[PDB]
């Protein structure tokens, strides 16, 4: 996963070409989940992606008030 976009000088595997993306998929069947999932509940192959999971729920709860408060 490092050299996949390193040899491509790319920051993210989704900016990696899908040819090389499927290349590691052939070896590694588990990578389907992060790569092939249309609406991943977590941003795949990131670090703070888990935090983004939290903060959006924060916003989701707030608007559930202001609109209901209004």
């Amino acid at each position: 996963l490092t050299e996949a976009c390193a040899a491509e000088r790319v920051v993210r595997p989704h900016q990696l070409s899908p040819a090389a993306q499927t290349a590691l998929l052939r070896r590694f069947p588990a990578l389907e989940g992060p790569l092939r999932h249309p609406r991943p509940v977590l941003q795949p192959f990131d670090i703070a992606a888990e935090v983004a999971f939290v903060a959006r729920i924060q916003i989701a709860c707030l608007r559930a008030l202001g609109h209901s408060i209004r």
Binding site: T2, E3, C5, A6, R9, V11, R12, I47
Partner: peptide, 11 residues
Amino acid sequence: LTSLHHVRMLL
């Protein structure tokens, strides 16, 4: 080198 360019791959 793989790590260093992967360090930016974090960002």
